C-alpha cells in the first residue's frame, strides 16, 4: 500500500473514463481532463497478462470422474471418494486463497501506478510549483496549454520558467 | 494554474474479496468461475454419445427385444442412460462383472 | 450437435475458465470443481466516486 489511492487522493474521477490514471488541469484558457495513455496501457498489459496467467496455465487431460462399484467393494468406493473430495479440497483451498492474494496485489499495483505518476511530475516541477494538498500542485507562474502539455508529455523545461517562479515565490 | 493527478471511478457496484478487506467495491472484475451450463448433451472430441433410450447397457448388449430402434453406431465418446432404466434384462438373473463391462464399453473407437 | 470439451449430467460446460461449480462428476477436459460460490478477480481499481 503506497498511500496514493484512498491516501492523499481521497476519491476518483468519474469524468475521466478513457483511462485509469490522468491529469486535471485548470488555466485561464480553460479546465480539462487528460488520461495518461502510456501508464494506462502498461497497466492494462500487466493485468491482461495476470488474468491470462491464472486462466491459461490450467491444462487438463481427458478424464472421466465417476466410477461404479457394487456392495462387495466398499473400500474401493471409499478410496475413490477419498481421492475426489481430496482433490476438490486442494483446489477449493488454492483458488479461493489465490484470487484473494492477487486481488490485494492488484490493488497495490494501481496504487503504485498513481504514486509514481505523482512523484514524476513533482521531480519535474521542483520549486516552480507548490503542493496544495489533495495530491496536486499550483504553479508559481502562468502555464498555458503548452506548459501543461509539456508537463504531461514529460518535458517541462524547468529553467525557462525558473526566474518568474522565483520572483513570484519570494513574496 | 493547477494540474491535479487522480484516478478513475465509475458506477460499477461489483465487489471483490481481498486478503485484508472483504467486500471491496471495484471498477471492473473478471469471473474465474463458471456457474452455468448449456442444459443439453453435446458431442465430445467430435464423436457423439451413444444414446440408449429406455434400455440399459446390459439390456442393449444382450439384445432386449424392445431395444431395436437403436441405430447402429461404430464409435461413441461416452454413453447416456436414464437414472432408472426399465427395459434391461428381461429374464431375471445376475450379470457378472456388470460394472467392468460398463467401464469397458464407455468408449470404443 | 454441439462441440464441447466438458460434459456434466445436466449439460456441457463451455469453459476457457479454470474453475467450475456445476457438478463434481464430469466427462472430458473440464475445469476443476470447487465448493466456492464466487471467485472474482479484480482487473480495475477501487471505486471511490
Amino acid at each position, epitope marked *: 500500500l503506497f498511500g496514493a489511492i484512498a491516501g492523499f487522493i481521497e476519491g476518483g474521477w468519474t*469524468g*475521466m*473514463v*478513457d*483511462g*485509469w490514471y*490522468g491529469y486535471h488541469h485548470q488555466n485561464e*484558457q*480553460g479546465s*480539462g*481532463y*487528460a*488520461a495518461d*495513455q*502510456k501508464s*494506462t*496501457q502498461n497497466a*492494462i498489459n500487466g*493485468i491482461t497478462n495476470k488474468v491470462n496467467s491464472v486462466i491459461e496455465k490450467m491444462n487438463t487431460q481427458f478424464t472421466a470422474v465417476g466410477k461404479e462399484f457394487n456392495k462387495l467393494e466398499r473400500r474401493m468406493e471409499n478410496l475413490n471418494k477419498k481421492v475426489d473430495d481430496g482433490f476438490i479440497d486442494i483446489w477449493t483451498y488454492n483458488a479461493e486463497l489465490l484470487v484473494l492474494l492477487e486481488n490485494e496485489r492488484t490493488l497495490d499495483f494501481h496504487d503504485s501506478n498513481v504514486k509514481n505518476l505523482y512523484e514524476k511530475v513533482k521531480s519535474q516541477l521542483k520549486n516552480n510549483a507548490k503542493e496544495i494538498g489533495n495530491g496536486c500542485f499550483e504553479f508559481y507562474h502562468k502555464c*498555458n*496549454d*503548452e506548459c501543461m*502539455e509539456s508537463v504531461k*508529455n514529460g518535458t517541462y523545461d524547468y529553467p525557462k520558467y525558473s526566474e518568474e517562479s522565483k520572483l513570484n515565490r519570494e513574496k | 494554474d493547477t494540474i491535479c493527478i487522480g484516478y*478513475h471511478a*465509475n458506477n*460499477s457496484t461489483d465487489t471483490v474479496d481481498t486478503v485484508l478487506e472483504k467486500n471491496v467495491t471495484v*471498477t*471492473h472484475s473478471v469471473n474465474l468461475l463458471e456457474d452455468s451450463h448449456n442444459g443439453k448433451l453435446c458431442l465430445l472430441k467430435g464423436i457423439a454419445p451413444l444414446q440408449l433410450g429406455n434400455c440399459s447397457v446390459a439390456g442393449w448388449i444382450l439384445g432386449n427385444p424392445e431395444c431395436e430402434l437403436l441405430i447402429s453406431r461404430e464409435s461413441w465418446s461416452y454413453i447416456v442412460e436414464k437414472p432408472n432404466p426399465e427395459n434391461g434384462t428381461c429374464y431375471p438373473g445376475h450379470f457378472a462383472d456388470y460394472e467392468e463391462l460398463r467401464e469397458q464399453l464407455s468408449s470404443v473407437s | 450437435e454441439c462441440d464441447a470439451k466438458c460434459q456434466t449430467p445436466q449439460g456441457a460446460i463451455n469453459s476457457s475458465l479454470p474453475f467450475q461449480n456445476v457438478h463434481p462428476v464430469t466427462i472430458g477436459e473440464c475445469p476443476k470443481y470447487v465448493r466456492s460460490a464466487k471467485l472474482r478477480m479484480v*482487473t*480495475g481499481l477501487r471505486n471511490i466516486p
Partner: antibody
Amino acid sequence: EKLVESGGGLVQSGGSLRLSCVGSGFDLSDNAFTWVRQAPGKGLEWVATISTNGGSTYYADSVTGRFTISKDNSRNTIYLQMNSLRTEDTAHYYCARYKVCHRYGLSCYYYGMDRWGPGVEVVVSS
Amino acid sequence: TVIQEPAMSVSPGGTVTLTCAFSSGSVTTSNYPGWYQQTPGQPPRQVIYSTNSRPTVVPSRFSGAISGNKATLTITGAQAEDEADYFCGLYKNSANIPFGGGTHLTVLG
C-alpha cells in the same frame, strides 16, 4: 449513420474558424470522436480527439494551445474551434468517429475510425 | 512512423498486396492495423479493422493479415471500383493513430 462537415473556407493568417460536424443516425453521448487533416502533398495527420463523455481531450503537439475540440450533445454536433491559424494549417479536414471498444471498463482508441466525413477544405494565405 | 508505398497498379481480376510497416520497429497484432479506403470526393471508409476483421458492407475481395512483421492488405480480383488511396492506421499506446503516406492503387484499363 453519416457525418456531415461544414464551416471551413478561405481565412487570413492569424484568423479563426469554427468547423462543425453533425452526425445523423446515432447519439454522440457514447462515442469518441476525432478531427484529422490531410495536407496537400502529405499523408493523413491526427489533429485532435475527444472522449466518449467529452471530459478528456487530446491535441497534436503541432496545434496545441490553438485548437479546441468540443461536443454539443443536444445539437449532435462536434466543433473544432481553430485560432491563430498559420500557413501550415492548409488542409482537408475530416471528422471521424472511433469504433466502440471497452477494455476493462474503459473506452478504447484501438480499432480506429469506423465512420468518416466527406471533409472540408480549409485554406489560409497572406 | 508508418511507411507505405507511393503507388501500385493491378490489372482487373488480379490479386494485389499492399504493405504497411514501421520505420524503426515491428507490426504485431497489438498494433491493430486498420486499412482505410479513400476515393476522391467521398469520405474514407474503414476497409479493415484489427488484423483481419472485415465489416459486413465491405466486399469480401478485401482481406488482411500480418506477414513478416508487416501489415498487408490483399485484394483478390480487383474490380474497377477499387481505384482509391489506401491508408494504414496503426495503434501506438495512445489515441494518436499514426497514418501511412498512402498507396494509390491504379486499376489498369
